Amino acid sequence: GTRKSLHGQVTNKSLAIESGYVMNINAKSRTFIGPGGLFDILAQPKDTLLFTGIAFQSKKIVLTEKDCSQILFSVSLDLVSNELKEVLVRKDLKVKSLDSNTQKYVDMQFEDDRQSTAKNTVMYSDQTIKYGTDFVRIFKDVKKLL
Amino acid sequence: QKALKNEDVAAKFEVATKMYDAGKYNKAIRLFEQLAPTYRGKPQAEKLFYMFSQSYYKTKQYYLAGYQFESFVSGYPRSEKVQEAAFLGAYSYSKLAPVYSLDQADTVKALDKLQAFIDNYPNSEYLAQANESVKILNGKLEKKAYENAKGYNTISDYKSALVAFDNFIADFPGTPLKEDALFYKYDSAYQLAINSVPSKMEERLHVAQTAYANLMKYKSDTKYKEKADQMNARVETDLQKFTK
Amino acid sequence: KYYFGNIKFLGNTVYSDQQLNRYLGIKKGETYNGVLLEKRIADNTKPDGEDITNLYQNNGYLFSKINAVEVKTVNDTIDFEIRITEGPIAYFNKIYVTGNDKTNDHVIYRELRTKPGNKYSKEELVRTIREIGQLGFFDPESIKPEFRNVDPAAGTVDIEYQLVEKGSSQVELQGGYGGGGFIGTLGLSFNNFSARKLFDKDAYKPLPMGDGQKVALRLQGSTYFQTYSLSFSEPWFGGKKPVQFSSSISYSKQFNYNYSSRDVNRNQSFNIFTVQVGLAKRLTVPDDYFVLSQSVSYQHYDLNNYYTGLFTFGNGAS
Numbered sequence: 189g190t191r192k193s194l195h196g197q198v199t200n201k202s203l204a205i206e207s208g209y210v211m212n213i214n215a216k217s218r219t220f221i222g223p224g225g226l227f228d229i230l231a232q233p234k235d236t237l238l239f240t241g242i243a244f245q246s247k248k249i250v251l252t253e254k255d256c257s258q259i260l261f262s263v264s265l266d267l268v269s270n271e272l273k274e275v276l277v278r279k280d281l282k283v284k285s286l287d288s289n290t291q292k293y294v295d296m297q298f299e300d301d302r303q304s305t306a307k308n309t310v311m312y313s314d315q316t317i318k319y320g321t322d323f324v325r326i327f328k329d330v331k332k333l334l
Numbered sequence: 335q336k337a338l339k340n341e342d343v344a345a346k347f348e349v350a351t352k353m354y355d356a357g358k359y360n361k362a363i364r365l366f367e368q369l370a371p372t373y374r375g376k377p378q379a380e381k382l383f384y385m386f387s388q389s390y391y392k393t394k395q396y397y398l399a400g401y402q403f404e405s406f407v408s409g410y411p412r413s414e415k416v417q418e419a420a421f422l423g424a425y426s427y428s429k430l431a432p433v434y435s436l437d438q439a440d441t442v443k444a445l446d447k448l449q450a451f452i453d454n455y456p457n458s459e460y461l462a463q464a465n466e467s468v469k470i471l472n473g474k475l476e477k478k479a480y481e482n483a484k485g486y487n488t489i490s491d492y493k494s495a496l497v498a499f500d501n502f503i504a505d506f507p508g509t510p511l512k513e514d515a516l517f518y519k520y521d522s523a524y525q526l527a528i529n530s531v532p533s534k535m536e537e538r539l540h541v542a543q544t545a546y547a548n549l550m551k552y553k554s555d556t557k558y559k560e561k562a563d564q565m566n567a568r569v570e571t572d573l574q575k576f577t578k
Numbered sequence: 579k580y581y582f583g584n585i586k587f588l589g590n591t592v593y594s595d596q597q598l599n600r601y602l603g604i605k606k607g608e609t610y611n612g613v614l615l616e617k618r619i620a621d622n623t624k625p626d627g628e629d630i631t632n633l634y635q636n637n638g639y640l641f642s643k644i645n646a647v648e649v650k651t652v653n654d655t656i657d658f659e660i661r662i663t664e665g666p667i668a669y670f671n672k673i674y675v676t677g678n679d680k681t682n683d684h685v686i687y688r689e690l691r692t693k694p695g696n697k698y699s700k701e702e703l704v705r706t707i708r709e710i711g712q713l714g715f716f717d718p719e720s721i722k723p724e725f726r727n728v729d730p731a732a733g734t735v736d737i738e739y740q741l742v743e744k745g746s747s748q749v750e751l752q753g754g755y756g757g758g759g760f761i762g763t764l765g766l767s768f769n770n771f772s773a774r775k776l777f778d779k780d781a782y783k784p785l786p787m788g789d790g791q792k793v794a795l796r797l798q799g800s801t802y803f804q805t806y807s808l809s810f811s812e813p814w815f816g817g818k819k820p821v822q823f824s825s826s827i828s829y830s831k832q833f834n835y836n837y838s839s840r841d842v843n844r845n846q847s848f849n850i851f852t853v854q855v856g857l858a859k860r861l862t863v864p865d866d867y868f869v870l871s872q873s874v875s876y877q878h879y880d881l882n883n884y885y886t887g888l889f890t891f892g893n894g895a896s
Contacts, residue, residue, distance in 0.1 A: 193591035195666045197730070219589050222663035223643060224730075228591045260666045260731045281641050281665075281730050286625070286703065286723065293625065293704050294711030294718040302866055303691060304709075305813040305820045308858035310871040314826065315763055315798040315807045316752065323751035435682040478683070482674070485687050486694075488818055497695040501672060 191215075191232045194251070196261035198225035200244065202276050205265055208241025224281040231256070239265055338365050343372055347382065359389035380413050387419065391426055400426040421460040424448040428467050434478040441471050480511045487518050495522035496541075513549075517558045520545035524565045528572070536576045542569045580610035584650075584657040592664055593633070601630055602660075610656055619644050619660065625704050634664060638697035640728075640735060641665030668698040671734035672727070677741040681715050681770060685790040688814065689713065692723075692737055703737070710741065713790065714769050717742040746770035747784055750796060758840060765796025771810075790814070802835030802842050821859040828852055834886050846892070848884045852877040 198205050198221055208221040214235045221227050221241065231237060233256050239247040244265040255261045286293065300307065337346035346365050353362035366386045373382050387402035403423035407416050424447035431441045448468050452461065483498035499519040503512060523545050527538030546566050549556060556562065583606045587598050602618050621627030634642035643663040650657045673694050675686050689709045691702045707721045720742040727736040750765040772788030775781050785793070792811045799805070807828030815823035834846035854875035861868040878895065885892035 193664070195664065220661055222589070222661065224641075226641065226663050226665050228589050228664040230591050259733045262731070280728055282643075283640055283725055283728060284631075284635070284643075285725070286707070288722065289719050290707050290711070290721045291719050293707040294721065296626075296704065296708050298705060298708055301691075302860065303689065303820065305822045306858040306860045306869045306871070308822060308824060308856040308871045308873060309869075310873045311824065311854055311856045312826070312828075312852060312875065313798075313805075314794075314809055314824075315765065315796040315805055315828070316750070317754040317761065317763055317798075320752040320754035320763075323753065324749055432679070435684065436680070437676055437678050439676070439679075482683055482687060485684050489688055490818075491693060493695050494693040497671070 189233060190256075191230050192256070193228055194231045194256060194261055195226070195228050195259070196263055198227065198239065198244075198263050198265045200265060200267050200276060202267055202271065202273050203243070204276060204279070205241070205244060205267070208239065208244065210240075211238050212236070213238060226281070239263065241265070244268060338368065343369055347373065347378075350382075351385070354385045354389060357392075359392050363389045363393065374409075380410050383410070384413075384415065384419070387422075391422060396426040396429045400424075400430075417455055417458060417460075420451050420455060421458070421464065424451045425460075425463070425467065428471060431471060431474060434474045434481060438475060438478060441474050445471050476506050476509050476511060479506060480515060483515070484518055487522050490525075492522040492526040495519070496526070513553055513556060516545070516549040516552055517556070517562065520549055520562065520565065524569065528568060535572075539569055539573050539576070542566075579654060580651075581655050582606060582608045582610055582658070583655040585660065586658075587660045587662060589662045589664065592637075592639070598630060598660070598662075601628070601633065615646055615658070619646060625700065630660075630662070632700065634662070635698075635700045638667035638669070638699070639664055640668040640698045641730060666730060666733050668728075668730075668733050668735045670694050670696050670698060670737060672736040673739075674736075675739040675741060677716075677739075677743065679743050680746070680787055681713075681743065681790075682788055685713075685770075686710065686739075686741070690739070698735060706739075710739065714748055715743060715746050717744050746787060750794075758837065759801045761798065761800045763796055763798040765794055765798075767792060767794035767796070773810075773812075801840075803830055803832040805830035815857065815859075819859060821857065823855075823857055825855045826853070834884065846884050846886060847882050849880040849882070850877055851880075 198208075205225050206221060206223060209218055210221065210227050210229060211218045212229055212231045212235055214232075215230065217229065219227050219229045229237065231251055233251055233253045235251045237249050237251060239249075244267050247263075247265055249263065251261075337349040340346065346369055350362045350365045350369070353359075353365070363386070366382065366389065369382065370386060373379055383402065383406045387399055387406055390396075390399035390402055393399075400423055403419045403426060406413070406419045407423065410416070413419070424444065427440065427447055428444035431444055432438065445468065448464055448471070452458075452464055452468075458464075479502050483495065483502045486492070486495035486498055496519060499515050499522065503515050503519070520542065523538060523542040527535060527542050530538050543566070546562060546569075549558075549562060582604055585599070585602065585604055585606075587595050590598055604615070604618065617627075618629060620631040621629045626632070631642065631644050634644075641663065642665055645661055645663075647659050647661060648656055649659045670692050671694060673687075673690060673692055675683065675690075678686060689706075689712075691706045691709065692699075696702075703723055707723065710716060710721050711718045720740070722740045724738045724740060725735055726738050727734075729735070746769050748767050748769060750763060750767060753760065753762045755761070768785050769790070769792045770787050771791040771793045772786045773791055775786040775788060778786065781787070790813050792809075792813070794809050794811075795807075796809070797804075797806050805828055807826055809824065809826040811825075812823040813820065815821040828851075830850045830852075831847055832850065834843045836842075852875055854873055856871065856873035858869060858871040860866065861870055880895050881889065881892050883892050
């Protein structure tokens with residue numbers, strides 16, 4: 189009995205389903221079917237979700253306590269027409285990844301945390317210069333620039 | 335020396351044979367490497383590559399011996415001693431297996447070769463040693479996973495230790511380290527419950543009881559029974575505060 | 579010329595339209611700037627940008643994707659309907675590292691901020707890369723975290739850290755300018771030393787390896803002083819907490835320097851021989867932001883014709 193956000197994925201057995209719109213007639217709200225069929229709506233149990241789109245047949249399901257609790261509420265939308273082209277081999281959802289050259293991340297400066305070794309501030313010098321010119325780094329950069 | 339510089343492959347091959355005869359594997363290897371390409375394919379190439387790989391094996395250069403033995407079976411298919419080269423090829427690659435702490439890239443490679451050797455040559459003479467090596471190699475993979483999971487418990491991080499141990503007792507079923515994993519899983523939940531936000535202290539207390547039961551059910555006469563019994567006393571005592 | 583207008587968000591269940599409008603910071607009547615819109619939605623130039631994408635990806639929404647779509651264009655006014663694909667929340671399930679041929683796993687696993695059983699966060703992944711690069715045993719350009727066994731239904735993602743070892747030994751060539759004079763330091767450091775296998779001569783390749791202990795032999799000098807030291811540091815003393823244990827033996831020769839005129843009289847100088855031991859550990863009480871540092875040191879000063887100021891015993895020792 190909570191209007192918590194509901195995350196779901198629409199899947200078709202013949203062609204990847206994208207585009208369209210999903211709306212909850214109870215709360216009169218609308219959403220879209222993004223890449224991979226993912227949709228997010230604020231719906232409560234015992235609610236009717238209407239699925240409409242160009243490539244699939246209109247569907248109307250009634251959400252229950254079981255569906256609202258699942259992490260990903262998958263929904264099967266019937267594709268209009270009956271082409272029956274293969275079985276639509278499943279493909280993993282795209283996920284953004286960091287840059288290949290991780291030098292920028294290594295160069296970032298961060299403060300010490302609970303998992304970092306403690307620095308002794310009551311000892312003499314260690315014969316090192318903090319934030320000083322690093323000639324070894326300069327030499328490495330020059331080589332890359334050749 | 336004289337045969338190496340000289341282009342007479344026959345004399346160098348004969349000299350190399352004498353070197354390999356008296357255990358001079360170090361000297362013969364140098365000459366054999368040069369004559370290996372030119373003497374390839376030739377009918378007498380079966381003896382050359384055979385002793386060539388044997389010298390590498392006897393010189394502890396397992397990596398070179400493994401590759402040489404592998405190509406010996408590949409190139410010469412029906413050699414009278416193909417089975418020996420097949421076993422020694424996988425057995426050599428297994429010797430280069432690093433400790434569980436380091437990357438187990440070679441361990442997986444050795445397992446593939448050893449496993450394929452058994453399937454391709456069943457009822458072999460080296461089957462006994464092959465099985466023993468496989469068991470030893472499989473132990474490294476299990477030890478690595480167990481130590482990694484236990485590593486969290488050492489640095490506290492009890493929340494991550496529970497997840498790591500749950501996967502270990504599932505990805506490696508029927509292992510001698512299961513008893514230890516069961517206890518450390520209980521300890522991880524015990525420490526996480528005794529010191530946790532009072533909002534979800536009951537949830538962690540229940541998990542501690544479940545872990546304790548699993549440990550006792552596995553081996554009733556567990557070595558950690560003395561400590562386990564003491565830990566359960568605190569959980570039961572603290573559970574009374576939430577007896578709504 | 580085109581002016582912005584009617585900026586609306588769709589699919590924003592986690593964050594309301596009001597919160598997102600503040601983050602975007604684009605009002606009606608402003609000049610249409612495509613670069614500005616993309617920069618505010620997803621700043622790819624930097625990983626710590628204050629964009630809407632980072633807001634979702636830093637809170638477990640690994641599958642989040644924000645794309646702007648131009649709905650209408652009338653009277654030189656363009657309207658946008660920002661579409662947000664939140665997706666299900668993901669948690670870290672299996673965290674394993676590969677490519678460590680000369681470094682033990684315990685050294686790398688203890689410096690990973692992506693703990694199993696925690697919600698996915700881009701900041702933790704970026705921080706982990708920075709920490710792994712701080713060790714110095716791997717290639718700073720090849721610390722690639724690869725997502726494996728991604729399960730959108732189960733909401734769990736496995737991270738594999740692919741590292742390329744590049745040798746623990748390092749050379750230090752630093753320079754600085756302070757106090758009106760240049761200062762330079764030169765030294766060799768072995769960041770993967772293992773004192774456990776010190777007596778073991780079987781494994782002595784470029785000094786015993788293994789644990790993340792660090793031994794350094796550096797030389798620092800300036801116009802009025804020169805110092806030679808040997809230091810040993812244990813980043814995790816005891817193996818349970820990040821307690822740092824460090825020791826050092828150094829010898830320095832400090833000449834008499836007049837900071838006012840920047841002139842040094844090489845005929846007056848003193849030598850200092852110091853031996854120090856220290857233990858620093860982060861305290862858990864009163865809070866986790868407290869750090870306690872302790873140190874014990876012994877020094878021997880040997881004056882050599884150092885008759886200046888309040889030093890009347892220019893040929894003595896302290």
